[model samples]
Target chain A: ALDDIDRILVRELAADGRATLSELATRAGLSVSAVQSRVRRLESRGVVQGYSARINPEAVGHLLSAFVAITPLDPSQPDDAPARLEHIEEVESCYSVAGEESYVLLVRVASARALEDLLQRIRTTANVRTRSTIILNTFYSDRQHIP
Target chain B: ALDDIDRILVRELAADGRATLSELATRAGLSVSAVQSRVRRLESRGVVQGYSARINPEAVGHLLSAFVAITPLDPSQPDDAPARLEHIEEVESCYSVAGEESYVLLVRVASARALEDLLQRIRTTANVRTRSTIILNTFYSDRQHIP
Candidate 1:
């Protein structure tokens, strides 16, 4: 079980994943080696699955982002759109939603024209009716928090 | 525009944020110091804004996660839902949506009881109509592609 030190380590890494071990040790009040072991344990335990960089979509030529709520064309048959869209590079996330829609995906693309093409591709490939909500602006994002 | 090497650094970090400078340099065919400069340069352009840990919410006492789409009851009464709810840490990210709802927030809570209370809390304080979608499972997420 994670104690205060583990929570502190997780919180610090969540805020800044590249923080040096010395900085982490200083913040969490552990030896640098101890901090190292804890971080390793966190990974082995699957509490912290991975570390990642937060990229600005526009900077990476992904100018458009939207949430597409998809329901299978025939009464949500099989519930397997996630597997189909898994290989789509622009599809960032797929979540099984417990609402009107069976599955929803967060998609990113380079342009409005690209968005148009990808939407049709998804519809045919997954056989789902898409109700998309285009994101006008991100006031704030990628701030999943700790407990 | 960033060259091919810069994309490699960004992609490598996104793939494994904990990668050492030596590993990154090896992957990109660059010296350690050269890669460090490239890394900082990418950050300077906001391409790599920051690194983050993907901590499992269940491991951290956050049992419920949902996407709450909100529209202000009286749009003129408040024009700053993002700022108003910024202090609400449970609301992970807030985006201005371009459909029925004005803003949609990704929120997490300890349990269904906490979720209900948080929903009412957002409804009352933010003065917004909340339409929420509970996420049963995250099939896949954070596939930070370089393309």
Candidate 2:
């Protein structure tokens, strides 16, 4: 859905979402009105979601983070897994994947007890078969594996 | 450094950073003055850095994100490489080793060309070996994964 010009507009915004129309136009090499119209169009198309606050996890006291790999009883029966995982407030990210695991989950909690509480929910509520490799540190993207 | 009381305080603040001393007291199960004093102590100790807008990449038109893995030629002599990588604007985050790569970088840009440009800069800037993996999707703590 994104054309070259649209891509350019997105690029400008990506550099800094707080950039003004004029600033976007300057960066995209387009006119102010053009950029504004394109942005509005993108928003209306639902390509542009909503803005939010990206708070520092450490600052908020969520010092513990982990990538938990989940295995399902039957890989073919991957029904409603995503929704079940989504219900956990602490589960940040989940992805269906290849390899021996059925899904990979990224969880953030204030303490080990909180993680234990979360794990119980995952096991009982989600019917997770097995969990392996509770990643200790993730410096990049969560389950999707940045690199 | 975060204990049960501190974790409770963090949970309350995570819900609302601007919670009043009285409100925080109720949520954290502590006295108003106690919560206030604890907050002050955390702030004074440099743990409570600050807050920021959790902006949406799509809303801002940032459509692309990649994780780059860096491996220096001489691992033993690469004390400053991660810090140097942190200095680059395109590199959003740099993580120290617990994996195959010494450092991993989270980067966002406008296009494939932008990614290429970024990779080229990294390759030439410090003459370090690098590999990249693109993220097709992103899931946050608040946003439930969309299928």
Candidate 3:
């Protein structure tokens, strides 16, 4: 349900979320107030969620970044499992994708020691009956640079 | 390679990367110039690499986030193959860890349709003989919550 302007604005803002309204308006070829209104509208519609600083988790000592594949004991029980999964502080993002796994979690931990401790916690508290964690090695920051 | 003051500063800045030097100094119990100088020192020392604004991937048409586990065909081969794996554009982050798999990747795609193509490209192009992917569901930001 995105219009052309939203697409363009989202791309520009995605690349540099901290760009000023003036900067964004300049890029979008719109007036500052016009762009501001659009942004506010987008936020109200739940399209523009929130702003955040992208810190390298490793830089903060949360070095272990991993994705955990989880399967519930009963998939037919309720779909709120994904919502429930998001409540864990260590669980970054979870997805119920069209795949064998019920959900996946993107998580960062302080250290290898912390990762082990987190896995134990996930197993007991998250109702994850089976799980596999793949530790990330490299990250691509720029999509345009992908070649 | 961490100083107590720098950690406090980073934690402060991580919560709000765009905080002015004066704001950071007030929070860190240092002078404005002192905060700026320490930030520069930390960057020079490789403690702080750069600043970034976090963008919601989905808001930018990035519909799927995936983590892939890759294992080379020849265990006896050199690390160069894995080094080559680092060159793939779709691969967001990769890591070599203590596990059955040699490497792992965090991948972000503009659409679910692109993920299969990306996985196929990785399988053939990088000589990734065995692989698996888990679509990311949700993410939690809590690096600042520790202290």
Candidate 4:
């Protein structure tokens, strides 16, 4: 269980992972070393996974994004499905869900042609059929945080 | 289009947003000012959205993650849907998709009860029906990058 101080630290990091130790110390009202140790503890306990930047996919070459719902042909052999999806770099997040689809994957690529190519590859996977929805616009997608 | 040097800088930042200017300079084979200028340019061009800390939701009390596919009752009224979803803080990411469902929302909550409550509220929306998928486990969610 996280205490008030730990929650404060987590909130600070969620807003800006790049904050310096001195900056975090000031915010937490603790010495730099104290804040450092607390952060280390959180990381070791697996509370704090890691830091990441939210890159704009459109600004980059990835102009397309889609959600692919995959249904496994053989439910008995679901172990290898994750490995197959992980092999595709564009498959950002794979979630095994409770709906008609066994897994839903978020994919980003450079264009429609690339998306089609990826879909084709996914369709060919030994025991899976896919249905995809292209993303038209995204207002915002902030990192998850504690309220 | 981003130059090779710009791409390198973006990749470095993507890996570690907290990396110091000196570190980025060394990695990009450029001076501190040059790397600084490039970063500023990328921000101005909106390529680098922002730096974020990837917090483990499960560790932070958000034990459930699900994807909600929303189908608009009236296809003509789509503009307000994004804003409505954005109003709910638990709705982390909203994507306008191309399928029977007009939008796909990624939601994180504290428990099954909370998820159901949120879904109830979503169902009350003027012209939308929602179907959700609970995430069993996330194999991996790679950070976005230039490709």
True-structure RMSD, every candidate: 1.5, 8.1, 4.3, 1.8
Worst 10 residues of 3 chain A by lDDT: A138-147
| lDDT value, residue A96 of candidate 2 | 59
Local distance difference test, per candidate? 0.89, 0.60, 0.65, 0.82
TM-score of every model?
0.96, 0.58, 0.71, 0.93
Q: Model 3: runs farther than 4 Å from truth? A: A1-49, A56-59, A63-65, A73-88, A110-113, A130-136, A139-147, B1-5, B23-30, B74-88, B110-113, B134-136, B139-147
Residue A26, candidate 2: Cα error in Å is 24
Error of 2 at A142 (Å): 13
In model 4, which runs have C-alpha deviations exceeding 4 angstroms?
A76-78, B73-78, B125-127
lDDT of model 3, residue B109: 83
Error of 4 at A20 (Å): 1.9
- Specify the CAPRI tier of model 2: incorrect
Better DockQ candidate (2, 4): 4
Give fnat, all candidates.
Answer: 0.90, 0.14, 0.32, 0.80
Q: After superposition, how far is residue A39 of candidate 4 from its true place, in Å?
A: 1.2
Residue-level error in angstroms, candidate 4, position A91: 1.2
Ranking by lDDT: 1, 4, 3, 2
Q: Supply candidate 2's per-residue lDDT for B84.
A: 62
**Model 4 whole-model lDDT (C-alpha atoms):** 0.82
